[PDB]
C-alpha cells in the first residue's frame, strides 16, 4: 500500500549461509505481501515444508503446499551449489563462512495489474547480479558476476523470469490481496501522543509518538513556528510491535518555555487527515 504509487507488493527473501565443517549451508526463505509476512521455510527445521505465517494463507489446498514446498527446496539446492560456484569465481577457500541472499517479487498497481518486477542476488552483503528495472538486461558489479551475466544472456533467462513476474507473480499477489482483504487492505491509523523529558532547565527533548499503525510507511515531522526543524529532530527507524503493527517516534530539543512554537505532524495513510499535535 505504497501511498505514492497506489501499489502493493509481493516479495520473497532468501538467505543461505555456509557452515564449513558443520553440515550443508542453512537456507531461510520468507515471503511478504507489503508489510505482512505470510510464509517461511527453514532447511534445518524438522517439517522440511513451506510453512504458513499469516492466517489468510492457511485457506489453501494441499497442491499449494506440495508445490511451494517443492520450489523453495529446489531453491535451496540451487543456491547451495551457487555458493560453491561463487566461491570458485572469487578464488577463496572453503575455510571461511559465506552468505548468499536472493530477493524476487513483483508489484501491482492501483489498476490491479503488473507494474514492477525484481530479481536480485547478493554475495557477502554486496550486490552481485540484478535484473534491471526493464526486466530485459542484467547488472553485474564484480567482474566475477559478469560471468553469470553472459551465461544468463545466452540462456535467455530474462524472458522466462519476466514470464514468472508478469505471470504467476502478479496472479499470486492479486489472490492473496483478496483472500486477506480484512488484513492487507485494512489501514490501522497511528495512535498519537507526546512526552516531555527536561534535559536541563535550559533545554528539553519533546518526543512525538505513533503506535500500532499499518502499513509501516509513516511520516513524522517537527515544525518550529510552522517551519521544518529537520536539523534538531531525532527520528528512529520504524519498528515492529509484534501484533502486525509498527511504532515510530520523533523527538526534538527545544528551549524551555517555547514548547508551544513547536508542532508535530503525522502523515499516514490511515488518517483522513494529517494530524497536528501540540504539547499543550
Amino acid at each position: 500500500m505504497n501511498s505514492v504509487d497506489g501499489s502493493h507488493s509481493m516479495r520473497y527473501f532468501s538467505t543461505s549461509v555456509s557452515r564449513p565443517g558443520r553440515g550443508e549451508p542453512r537456507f531461510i526463505a520468507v515471503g511478504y505481501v507489503d508489510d505482512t509476512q505470510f510464509v517461511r521455510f527453514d532447511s534445518d527445521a524438522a517439517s522440511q515444508r513451506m510453512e504458513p505465517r499469516a492466517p489468510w494463507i492457511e485457506q489453501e489446498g494441499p497442491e499449494y503446499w506440495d508445490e511451494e514446498t517443492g520450489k523453495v527446496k529446489a531453491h535451496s539446492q540451487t543456491d547451495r551449489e551457487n555458493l560453491r560456484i561463487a566461491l570458485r569465481y572469487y578464488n577463496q577457500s572453503e575455510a571461511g563462512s559465506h552468505t548468499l541472499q536472493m530477493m524476487f517479487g513483483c508489484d501491482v498497481g492501483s489498476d490491479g495489474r503488473f507494474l514492477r518486477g525484481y530479481h536480485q542476488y547478493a554475495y557477502d552483503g554486496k550486490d552481485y547480479i540484478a535484473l534491471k528495472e526493464d526486466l530485459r538486461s542484467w547488472t553485474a558489479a564484480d567482474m566475477a558476476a559478469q560471468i553469470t551475466k553472459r551465461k544468463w544472456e545466452a540462456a535467455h533467462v530474462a524472458e522466462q523470469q519476466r514470464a514468472y513476474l508478469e505471470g504467476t507473480c502478479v496472479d499470486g499477489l492479486r489472490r492473496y490481496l483478496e483472500n486477506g482483504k480484512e488484513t492487507l487492505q485494512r489501514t490501522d491509523p497511528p495512535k498519537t501522543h507526546m512526552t516531555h523529558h527536561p534535559i536541563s532547565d535550559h533545554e528539553a527533548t519533546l518526543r512525538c509518538w505513533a503506535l500500532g499503525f499499518y502499513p509501516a510507511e509513516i511520516t513524522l515531522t517537527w515544525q518550529r513556528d510552522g517551519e521544518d526543524q529537520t536539523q534538531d529532530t531525532e527520528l528512529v527507524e520504524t519498528r515492529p510491535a509484534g501484533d502486525g503493527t509498527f511504532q515510530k517516534w520523533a523527538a526534538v530539543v527545544v528551549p524551555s518555555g517555547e514548547e508551544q512554537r513547536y508542532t508535530c505532524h503525522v502523515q499516514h495513510e490511515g488518517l483522513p487527515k494529517p494530524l497536528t499535535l501540540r504539547w499543550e
Binding site: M50, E68, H75, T78, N82, F104, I147, Y164, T168
Partner: peptide, 9 residues
C-alpha cells in the same frame, strides 16, 4: 507463489 526457474552461476 514462489519462483519456479532455477539457474546456476
Amino acid at each position: 507463489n514462489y519462483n519456479y526457474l532455477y539457474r546456476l552461476f
